[PDB]
Enzyme design. Structure first.
Site, PDB file in Angstrom:
ATOM      1  N   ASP A 139      36.148 -19.484  15.116  1.00  0.00           N
ATOM      2  CA  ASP A 139      34.792 -19.081  15.453  1.00  0.00           C
ATOM      3  C   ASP A 139      34.376 -17.770  14.811  1.00  0.00           C
ATOM      4  OD1 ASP A 139      32.267 -19.547  16.712  1.00  0.00           O
ATOM      5  OD2 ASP A 139      32.910 -18.526  18.548  1.00  0.00           O
ATOM      6  N   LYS A 142      32.152 -18.022   8.840  1.00  0.00           N
ATOM      7  CA  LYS A 142      32.294 -19.449   8.523  1.00  0.00           C
ATOM      8  C   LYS A 142      33.007 -19.680   7.218  1.00  0.00           C
ATOM      9  CE  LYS A 142      30.430 -19.420  12.431  1.00  0.00           C
ATOM     10  NZ  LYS A 142      31.459 -19.199  13.497  1.00  0.00           N
ATOM     11  N   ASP A 167      34.213 -24.230  15.699  1.00  0.00           N
ATOM     12  CA  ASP A 167      32.846 -24.143  16.137  1.00  0.00           C
ATOM     13  C   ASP A 167      31.914 -24.166  14.900  1.00  0.00           C
ATOM     14  OD1 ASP A 167      30.753 -23.933  17.959  1.00  0.00           O
ATOM     15  OD2 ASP A 167      30.676 -21.704  17.953  1.00  0.00           O
ATOM     16  N   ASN A 168      30.660 -24.547  15.103  1.00  0.00           N
ATOM     17  CA  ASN A 168      29.607 -24.309  14.145  1.00  0.00           C
ATOM     18  C   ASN A 168      29.774 -25.053  12.874  1.00  0.00           C
ATOM     19  OD1 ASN A 168      30.048 -21.099  15.316  1.00  0.00           O
ATOM     20  ND2 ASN A 168      28.176 -22.221  15.759  1.00  0.00           N
ATOM     21  N   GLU A 197      24.439 -23.158  20.800  1.00  0.00           N
ATOM     22  CA  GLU A 197      24.345 -22.453  22.040  1.00  0.00           C
ATOM     23  C   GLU A 197      22.889 -22.027  22.323  1.00  0.00           C
ATOM     24  OE1 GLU A 197      26.498 -21.722  19.437  1.00  0.00           O
ATOM     25  OE2 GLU A 197      26.544 -19.562  19.037  1.00  0.00           O
TER      26      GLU A 197
HETATM   27  C1  LIG Z   1      37.987 -11.834   9.444  1.00  0.00           C
HETATM   28  N1  LIG Z   1      37.769 -11.768  10.883  1.00  0.00           N
HETATM   29  N2  LIG Z   1      38.803 -11.716  11.774  1.00  0.00           N
HETATM   30  C2  LIG Z   1      38.314 -11.681  13.005  1.00  0.00           C
HETATM   31  C3  LIG Z   1      36.880 -11.695  12.984  1.00  0.00           C
HETATM   32  C4  LIG Z   1      35.849 -11.665  13.936  1.00  0.00           C
HETATM   33  C5  LIG Z   1      34.529 -11.654  13.492  1.00  0.00           C
HETATM   34  C6  LIG Z   1      33.377 -11.555  14.494  1.00  0.00           C
HETATM   35  O1  LIG Z   1      33.728 -12.232  15.717  1.00  0.00           O
HETATM   36  C7  LIG Z   1      32.075 -12.079  13.923  1.00  0.00           C
HETATM   37  C8  LIG Z   1      30.928 -11.325  13.587  1.00  0.00           C
HETATM   38  C9  LIG Z   1      29.768 -11.929  13.092  1.00  0.00           C
HETATM   39  C10 LIG Z   1      29.703 -13.325  12.963  1.00  0.00           C
HETATM   40  C11 LIG Z   1      30.844 -14.053  13.315  1.00  0.00           C
HETATM   41  C12 LIG Z   1      30.921 -15.532  13.184  1.00  0.00           C
HETATM   42  N3  LIG Z   1      30.037 -16.294  14.039  1.00  0.00           N
HETATM   43  C13 LIG Z   1      28.832 -16.637  13.555  1.00  0.00           C
HETATM   44  O2  LIG Z   1      28.382 -16.207  12.462  1.00  0.00           O
HETATM   45  C14 LIG Z   1      28.002 -17.498  14.402  1.00  0.00           C
HETATM   46  C15 LIG Z   1      26.664 -17.603  14.067  1.00  0.00           C
HETATM   47  C16 LIG Z   1      25.816 -18.441  14.766  1.00  0.00           C
HETATM   48  C17 LIG Z   1      24.387 -18.529  14.417  1.00  0.00           C
HETATM   49  C18 LIG Z   1      23.708 -19.742  14.520  1.00  0.00           C
HETATM   50  C19 LIG Z   1      22.345 -19.869  14.203  1.00  0.00           C
HETATM   51  C20 LIG Z   1      21.709 -18.708  13.766  1.00  0.00           C
HETATM   52  F1  LIG Z   1      20.391 -18.798  13.478  1.00  0.00           F
HETATM   53  C21 LIG Z   1      22.353 -17.497  13.630  1.00  0.00           C
HETATM   54  C22 LIG Z   1      23.707 -17.394  13.946  1.00  0.00           C
HETATM   55  C23 LIG Z   1      26.337 -19.201  15.836  1.00  0.00           C
HETATM   56  C24 LIG Z   1      27.683 -19.079  16.162  1.00  0.00           C
HETATM   57  O3  LIG Z   1      28.177 -19.848  17.185  1.00  0.00           O
HETATM   58  C25 LIG Z   1      28.556 -18.249  15.425  1.00  0.00           C
HETATM   59  O4  LIG Z   1      29.843 -18.297  15.822  1.00  0.00           O
HETATM   60  C26 LIG Z   1      31.990 -13.452  13.801  1.00  0.00           C
HETATM   61  C27 LIG Z   1      34.248 -11.711  12.112  1.00  0.00           C
HETATM   62  C28 LIG Z   1      35.235 -11.778  11.149  1.00  0.00           C
HETATM   63  C29 LIG Z   1      36.566 -11.747  11.582  1.00  0.00           C
HETATM   64 CL   LIG Z   2      24.298 -24.030  25.724  1.00  0.00          CL
HETATM   65 CL   LIG Z   3      32.233 -17.061  22.281  1.00  0.00          CL
HETATM   66 MG   LIG Z   4      30.278 -19.917  17.086  1.00  0.00          MG
END
Ligand SMILES: Cn1ncc2cc([C@H](O)c3cccc(CNC(=O)c4cc(-c5ccc(F)cc5)cc(O)c4O)c3)ccc21
Ligand SMILES: [Cl-]
Ligand SMILES: [Cl-]
Ligand SMILES: [Mg+2]
Length: 213
Positions: A139, A142, A167-168, A197
């Site tokens: 998650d 991506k 996810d996603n 979500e």
């Molecule tokens: C390397 N590394 N190691 C650990 C680690 C942890 C992170 C952060 O947790 C982090 C920060 C920013 C984004 C994310 C990914 N998640 C998403 O981008 C996302 C987007 C949307 C969405 C959907 C529709 C939209 F219009 C906008 C955003 C819906 C979703 O469920 C998501 O999970 C994860 C990052 C890199 C990392």
């Molecule tokens: Cl939901």
């Molecule tokens: Cl979550």
């Molecule tokens: Mg997600």
């Protein structure tokens, strides 16, 4: 403050300490009524619950904690003694996630590691005494789903039957990962159609079960 701080405060003030379900419900309410956030949410969360229950994993790795929604969701369903390790690169979010877990009373089951997945994955065996993982929840960014799946395999962390749940896979989408696992003899894949979500937008989870080399 930030949105993530506002979500934590809302939980602290609208949920019961030690009650994970109340914590999920509070987050879902806030994100439906106040401010959207990228938690896995209740729709996809119900699918995740069904998968956790089916497999009863003893050791789960999550890549991408955010505010700890999915960590609460999975950890509340783990059997006594089972564990979750969750990786979060953003230190502010790591701290929110820890506080969320603490409020939920799940801190003994979960270890929240603040760092990048590609740096921490190679340390799991020697530093965190992992042998192999029962389940992985993807998650994070991506474009990292595929590289980190390949890294997990390189590091010897997958076994026959390890469940990857992503996810996603539709929104934002993870096209390289999905093409790869669906084309690989080393994975058995299942698509679970759902909704983004808190939104009337189709999304989905992919389950990819590792079959060995
Ligand atoms: C390397 N590394 N190691 C650990 C680690 C942890 C992170 C952060 O947790 C982090 C920060 C920013 C984004 C994310 C990914 N998640 C998403 O981008 C996302 C987007 C949307 C969405 C959907 C529709 C939209 F219009 C906008 C955003 C819906 C979703 O469920 C998501 O999970 C994860 C990052 C890199 C990392
Ligand atoms: Cl939901
Ligand atoms: Cl979550
Ligand atoms: Mg997600």
């Amino acid at each position: 403050d930030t949105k993530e701080q506002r979500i934590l405060r809302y939980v602290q003030q609208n949920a019961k300490p030690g009650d994970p379900q109340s914590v999920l419900e509070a987050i879902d309410t806030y994100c439906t009524q106040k401010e959207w956030a990228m938690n896995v949410g209740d729709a996809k969360g119900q699918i995740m619950d069904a998968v956790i229950r089916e497999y009863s994993p003893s050791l789960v790795l999550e890549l991408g904690a955010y505010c700890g929604y999915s960590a609460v969701r999975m950890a509340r369903l783990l059997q006594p003694g089972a564990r979750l390790l969750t990786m979060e690169i953003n230190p502010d979010c790591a701290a929110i996630t820890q506080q969320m877990l603490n409020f939920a009373g799940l801190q003994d089951k979960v270890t929240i590691l603040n760092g990048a997945s590609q740096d921490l994955i190679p340390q799991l065996k020697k530093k965190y005494d992992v042998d192999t993982l029962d389940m992985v929840f993807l998650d994070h960014w991506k474009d990292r789903y595929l590289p980190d799946t390949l890294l997990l395999e390189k590091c010897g962390l997958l076994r026959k039957g390890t469940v990857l749940l992503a996810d996603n896979v539709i929104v934002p989408g993870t096209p390289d990962f999905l093409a790869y696992v669906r084309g690989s003899s080393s994975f058995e894949c299942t698509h679970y159609s759902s909704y983004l979500e808190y939104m009337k937008v189709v999304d989905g989870l992919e389950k990819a079960i590792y079959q060995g080399p």
